[PDB]
Every structure is written in structure tokens, then in C-alpha cells.
Amino acid sequence: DMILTEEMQKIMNLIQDDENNVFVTGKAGSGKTTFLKYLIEKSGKNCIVAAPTGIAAINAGGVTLHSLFGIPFGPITPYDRLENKFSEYKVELLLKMELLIIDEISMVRPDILDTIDRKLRWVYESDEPFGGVQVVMFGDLFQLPPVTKKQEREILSDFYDGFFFFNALVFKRTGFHIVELTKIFRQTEPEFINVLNNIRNYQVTSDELDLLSELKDRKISSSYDNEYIHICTHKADVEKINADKLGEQEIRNYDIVIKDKFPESSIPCDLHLKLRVGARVMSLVNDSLKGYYNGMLGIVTALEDNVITVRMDNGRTIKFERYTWSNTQYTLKDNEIVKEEIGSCTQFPLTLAWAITIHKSQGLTFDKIIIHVSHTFCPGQLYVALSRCRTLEGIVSDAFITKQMIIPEYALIDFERAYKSEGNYYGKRL
Ligand SMILES: Nc1ncnc2c1ncn2[C@@H]1O[C@H](COP(=O)(O)OP(=O)(O)O)[C@@H](O)[C@H]1O
Numbered sequence: 001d002m003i004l005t006e007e008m009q010k011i012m013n014l015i016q017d018d019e020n021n022v023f024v025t026g027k028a029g030s031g032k033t034t035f036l037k038y039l040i041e042k043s044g045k046n047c048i049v050a051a052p053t054g055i056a057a058i059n060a061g062g063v064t065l066h067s068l069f070g071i072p073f074g075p076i077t078p079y080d081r082l083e084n085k086f087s088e089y090k091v092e093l094l095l096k097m098e099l100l101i102i103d104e105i106s107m108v109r110p111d112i113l114d115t116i117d118r119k120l121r122w123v124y125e126s127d128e129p130f131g132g133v134q135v136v137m138f139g140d141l142f143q144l145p146p147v148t149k150k151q152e153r154e155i156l157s158d159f160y161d162g163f164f165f166f167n168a169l170v171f172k173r174t175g176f177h178i179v180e181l182t183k184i185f186r187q188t189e190p191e192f193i194n195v196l197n198n199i200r201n202y203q204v205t206s207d208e209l210d211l212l213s214e215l216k217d218r219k220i221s222s223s224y225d226n227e228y229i230h231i232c233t234h235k236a237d238v239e240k241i242n243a244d245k246l247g248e249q250e251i252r253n254y255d256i257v258i259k260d261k262f263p264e265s266s267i268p269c270d271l272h273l274k275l276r277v278g279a280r281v282m283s284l285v286n287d288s289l290k291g292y293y294n295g296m297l298g299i300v301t302a303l304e305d306n307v308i309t310v311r312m313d314n315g316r317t318i319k320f321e322r323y324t325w326s327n328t329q330y331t332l333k334d335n336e337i338v339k340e341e342i343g344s345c346t347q348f349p350l351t352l353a354w355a356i357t358i359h360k361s362q363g364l365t366f367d368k369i370i371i372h373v374s375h376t377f378c379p380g381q382l383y384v385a386l387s388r389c390r391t392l393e394g395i396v397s398d399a400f401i402t403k404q405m406i407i408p409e410y411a412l413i414d415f416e417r418a419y420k421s422e423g424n425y426y427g428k429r430l
């Protein structure tokens with residue numbers, strides 16, 4: 001069923017040359033996850049998939065960067081000394097890795113990449129960056145990174161020109177090609193995409209500005225019974241909203257089931273799923289054959305012991321059973337990198353969805369959203385909240401969206417401008 005686009009093939013063309021590192025970027029719904037899987041199968045290489053957080057690793061079927069490379073937590077300057085206490089099997093695993101795939105690369109502080117480059121050089125006893133391991137990075141540039149602690153910020157400041165992954169010092173020694181996936185498979189909305197590009201590039205016209213002014217509506221934005229999902233900055237506001245609407249009447253509780261070794265921070269579901277008939281909910285996984293995807297909304301119609309029946313917004317009724325997330329780790333089998341399960345957790349793939357945070361809805365899109373203007377805006381945070389919808393028309397705002405709420409991220413605009421001018425390549429050329 002998959003389409004192989006020209007941009008996808010162009011990435012495959014680049015990684016044939018084992019010396020090419022590649023940054024694959026694109027908005028939500030542009031096929032990043034789907035193409036990552038195809039990339040693994042067609043690469044012809046022993047791949048390891050890693051991500052900066054536990055939930056992202058679980059979702060992409062890989063491991064966290066910190067566990068894979070024994071990275072200590074906290075900022076790391078070039079001259080902090082690394083213990084390098086790799087077990088023998090980890091060393092042999094890393095020595096067979098020909099292709100490192102890092103998902104959600106925009107969440108990766110640049111010192112983590114340099115620490116990875118340093119550990120691999122130690123393991124390969126090599127001066128080549130990343131010990132010569134080819135690196136392919138997936139993520140959306142313009143999704144804001146985790147706010148770097150004040151401590152972290154000024155330690156790394158003495159060594160780093162900025163706090164994005166591409167500020168890693170290793171990129172003064174190697175570089176990477178960039179390919180953007182621009183086909184949004186779910187829908188094709190040129191005007192909305194154009195507004196979004198103009199907001200993030202700080203090139204908004206006065207038309208777009210009032211196009212943005214219209215999105216306000218105090219009636220809809222204060223209602224919680226309308227298939228609009230409330231998108232809020234703060235987790236506390238979202239907890240209150242989903243608790244208020246859930247209420248205390250006729251609530252059933254379903255407990256997560258853990259088997260063996262599962263990191264607490266990697267758990268991708270509710271620990272205690274509290275629901276009730278009529279509760280607004282969101283699907284957390286994709287199962288194409290039962291016809292639900294990560295992000296789909298619905299209303300709870302029936303509650304049983306092993307089955308929650310939900311009427312999705314598209315008119316369908318689905319019988320949700322418990323889903324099992326597998327905690328995997330990589331290993332060798334006749335010098336070939338394979339996976340092995342070391343634990344799992346099991347739970348219905350549903351969560352309360354009258355509201356959701358910006359953070360929890362990263363990489364997701366909805367038909368209808370309500371933006372709770374969160375005054376004291378930051379850089380990019382308006383673009384991020386509008387990016388959670390599929391059209392301009394499904395967006396309703398708390399208050400009026402004003403020009404001063406558009407806070408650009410000039411480091412990202414300069415990065416794009418720089419690579420698009422130098423042949424879709426950043427860093428040192430070999
Ligand atoms: N190459 C492709 N061909 C056809 N459909 C695709 C392709 N890539 C993605 N899709 C569809 O678009 C949706 C988004 O895919 P996904 O890989 O999750 O995008 P991203 O990871 O960039 O958010 C999926 O539900 C999938 O059905």
C-alpha cells in the first residue's frame with residue numbers, strides 16, 4: 001500500500017554511499033515513521049534505531065540513546081571524562097552496527113551527539129566521526145526542543161553556539177545531507193501549509209494576520225462537548241479538564257499490567273485508565289486492520305472487562321482490546337543485529353481526550369482543535385499549536401491571535417536558509 005515518493009527514493013540514493021549521513025525531516029503526517037521502517041528493510045545494513053526519550057524509543061521499536069551508549073544524564077562538555085563501562089556484548093553489538101538511526105533528532109541536545117561520537121570512536125578505536133558508523137536522523141525541525149535547564153544552558157554555553165542537534169561539535173568534522181518529506185498523505189491543504197510556513201519563517205502577511213484573527217470564538221472555545229480537542233501548554237490544565245468532564249459517576253478503572261523489565265519513563269499508556277460511557281478518548285496506536293490510528297478520537301459507548309467499545313468521529317465503532325507494548329533491546333544472532341523482548345506492558349490503547357498538552361500531541365494532527373492562548377508566548381509556540389490541526393478551518397482560539405504572539409526561532413530559520421543555499425547539506429563536506 002505504501003507509495004515510494006521521489007524524496008523517499010532520493011534519501012535511499014544518498015545512503016547507498018556509506019559516507020553520506022542524512023537528516024530526514026518533514027511535518028507530522030509526511031511519512032517519517034513509515035519511511036524509517038522501509039529504510040531499515042531496504043538499507044542492506046545492520047541498523048540500530050534509537051531515540052532520546054523512552055516513549056519515543058518504544059514507539060519506534062528501538063532503544064533510548066542513553067541506555068544504548070551508556071550516556072550519563074546531564075550536560076557533558078568535551079573535556080568531561082567518560083567512564084566507557086561498556087559490557088563486552090555491548091562492544092560487540094556496536095562493532096556490528098553499520099547504520100545508526102536516531103528518531104526525534106530535534107529532541108537531542110547537541111552534547112548527546114558529541115558524547116555518542118566520542119563513545120563510538122573509543123569503541124572502534126578510530127578518528128573518524130561516529131567511528132565511521134553512518135548516521136541517519138529523523139525528526140521535525142520546528143517542534144520545539146525540551147526547555148534546557150538553566151544549569152545545562154550555561155555549562156554548554158562555553159562550548160556550543162546553540163542548543164539544537166546541528167550545533168554538535170562533530171559537525172565541524174562531518175556533515176549530513178537534508179531531505180524534506182513534503183507530501184502530507186492524509187490531506188493536501190496548500191493554503192494552510194503556506195500560512196504555517198510563513199509563521200515559522202516570520203514572513204506573515206497582513207492577510208494571513210487577519211486570516212489568523214478570525215480563528216477566535218469565545219462560544220466554542222469555552223465548550224467541552226463539541227468534538228474539538230482542547231490543546232493546552234500545561235499538563236495541570238489538561239488534567240483538570242479531563243477530570244472535570246470524566247466526573248465520578250459510573251467510572252471504571254483498568255490497571256496497566258507489567259511483565260518483566262519495563263522502564264517507568266518509557267510507559268506509553270495510562271497506569272490506571274479511568275473511563276465511563278460517553279467519555280471522549282483518543283487512540284494511542286495504529287492498527288490498520290481494525291481501522292484506528294494514533295490520534296484518532298471517539299466517544300466511549302460500552303465498557304466491559306476486556307473490551308471498550310468506542311464510536312470514532314468518522315462514524316465507526318471499534319472494539320478495543322488491551323494492547324501490549326514490547327520493551328526491546330538489540331543483540332547479535334550469528335553476527336546479525338536482531339531484537340529481543342526484555343519486558344512489556346499491557347493496557348487498552350486509549351486515553352482521555354477532552355484535552356491534550358502540546359507535548360503529548362507532538363507528531364499528531366486533529367480535525368478540530370481549540371487553542372488556549374497561553375500568554376507569555378515563547379519562540380515557535382504559536383506555530384506548534386496551529387500545527388496540531390489538519391486545516392485552517394478546524395482551528396478555534398481562546399483569544400485573538402495577535403502579531404506579537406508570533407515569536408520566531410531565528411536559529412532554525414538560519415539553519416534552513418543555510419542548508420538550502422549550500423545544496424541541502426550542513427556541516428563539513430568530505
Ligand atoms: N509512503 C507512504 N505511502 C502511503 N501512505 C503513507 C506513507 N507514509 C505515510 N503514510 C500515511 O500517512 C500517515 C502518516 O504516516 P507517518 O509515517 O506516521 O508520518 P510521520 O511519521 O511523518 O508523522 C500514516 O497513517 C500512513 O497511513
Ligand code: ALF
Pocket residue numbers: 028029032033034139363
Ligand atoms: F514516527 Al512519526 F510523526 F515521526 F509518526
